[PDB]
């Protein structure tokens, strides 16, 4: 869960995908610390979706380094450097 892999959860019989993100989300919801947009940004997000990016990694990359009053090619470039 602290590694956030659903594959280890779903091989257990009776455990599907939806149960796996429920376990992940609702345990990361504070129990497991202890051991027991603009046109340019929308264009960028759509380009990332068309280039294999799932929307969450296309979302928090935009959120971390937003682009302001300048053209798309450079903040998408530094965002691609940003996600590394």
């Amino acid at each position: 869960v602290q590694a956030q892999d659903t594959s280890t959860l779903v091989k257990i019989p009776g455990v599907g995908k939806k149960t796996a993100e429920r376990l992940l989300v609702e345990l990361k919801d504070r129990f497991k610390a202890w051991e027991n947009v603009s046109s340019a940004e929308a264009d960028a997000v759509s380009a990332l979706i068309a280039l294999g990016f799932k929307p969450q990694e296309a979302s928090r990359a935009v959120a971390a380094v937003p682009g302001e009053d300048l053209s798309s090619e450079e903040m998408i470039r530094q965002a691609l450097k940003g996600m590394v």
């Binding site: 759509s46 068309a50 280039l51 294999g52 990016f53 090619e73 470039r77 691609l80 996600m83």
Partner: protein, 309 residues
């Protein structure tokens, strides 16, 4: 000086490779011209990625070699494109083992250094800084021919002769701090089945085994003990290979017989035999399989000294 040396003078490769292309790029660098794409390929385990890293080390340009099977995704390809800058070099391992989407997002970068990105939706024009792909594949035979046409320089790797292998053993043992004699260096080179980096690994193993039974110095008795424990003689014949060839000379006297017949005789799987056993002997003049069957030289018989006309 490391496990793999990074100096062009510290690696005694093929004389054509030792002469031409790194001297060419050494005298060509500094012209404010982006280097074109260069391919190196051959037998596996020969450090083609390491050799590309060496070359980029003398070029003095930021470089990170990444494995193609690891990087299946064009998004990480865009990440490596944006990580580097104008006039840089990049080394890719096993280009032929890429998912095709990487290839068609890579062709316009080979065309005009252009990253055409799809999002009435329209594609966006995303230019790239000048850069260079250095190719290091085991076998890029199934790669697409237009991608070859976009690539400029290709070098092969071949079974190195005994002198080059002996010099490689000597320089790598000097790196290892060994006291091996030149006769022992030749013995280690002949025991190694060519393959200069795998020959270096075999020399490392021989050095460790000799240090287990003594010091770093290697004597012909130490070489004989290493051959006995590895069950591989100076001719490079495997113990399984030696047993199979002894059975063949004890049955058909080297006559041309079927591969299936000998496979049934030895109770071994024939495809593994074809891809493992006879290749090592057949780069040299040992096995001469014909439309009638397999033919074996008497030089292979010189290991035991029994031959027929």
């Amino acid at each position: 000086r490391a496990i793999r040396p990074l100096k062009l003078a510290d690696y005694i490769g093929q004389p054509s490779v030792r002469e031409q292309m790194e001297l060419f790029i050494h005298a060509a660098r500094g012209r404010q011209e982006a280097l074109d794409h260069t391919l190196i390929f051959g037998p596996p385990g020969l450090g083609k990625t390491t050799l590309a890293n060496i070359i980029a080390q003398e070029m003095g340009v930021s470089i990170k070699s990444t494995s193609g099977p690891v990087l299946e995704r064009p998004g990480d390809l865009a990440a490596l494109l944006t990580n580097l800058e104008a006039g840089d070099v990049l080394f890719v391992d096993e280009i032929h083992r890429l998912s095709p989407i990487v290839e068609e997002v890579l062709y316009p970068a080979m065309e005009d250094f252009q990253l055409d990105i799809m999002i009435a939706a329209r594609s966006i024009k995303l230019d790239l800084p000048p850069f260079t792909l250095v190719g290091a594949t085991t076998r890029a035979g199934m790669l697409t021919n237009p991608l070859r046409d976009r690539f400029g320089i290709v070098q092969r790797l071949e079974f190195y002769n005994v002198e080059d292998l002996a010099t490689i053993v000597s320089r790598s043992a000097g790196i290892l701090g060994l006291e091996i004699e030149p006769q022992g260096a030749a013995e280690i080179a002949k025991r190694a089945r060519g393959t200069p980096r795998i020959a270096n690994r075999l020399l490392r193993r021989v050095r460790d085994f000799a240090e287990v039974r003594g010091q770093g110095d290697i004597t012909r008795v130490i070489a004989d003990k290493a051959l006995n424990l590895l069950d591989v003689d100076e001719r490079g014949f495997d113990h399984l290979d030696r047993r199979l060839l002894l059975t063949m000379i004890d049955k058909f006297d080297g006559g041309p017989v079927g591969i299936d017949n000998l496979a049934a005789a030895l109770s071994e799987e024939r495809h593994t035999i074809e891809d493992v056993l006879e290749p090592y002997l057949i780069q040299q003049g040992y096995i001469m399989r014909t439309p009638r069957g397999r033919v074996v030289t008497r030089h292979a018989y010189l290991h035991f000294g029994l031959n027929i006309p």
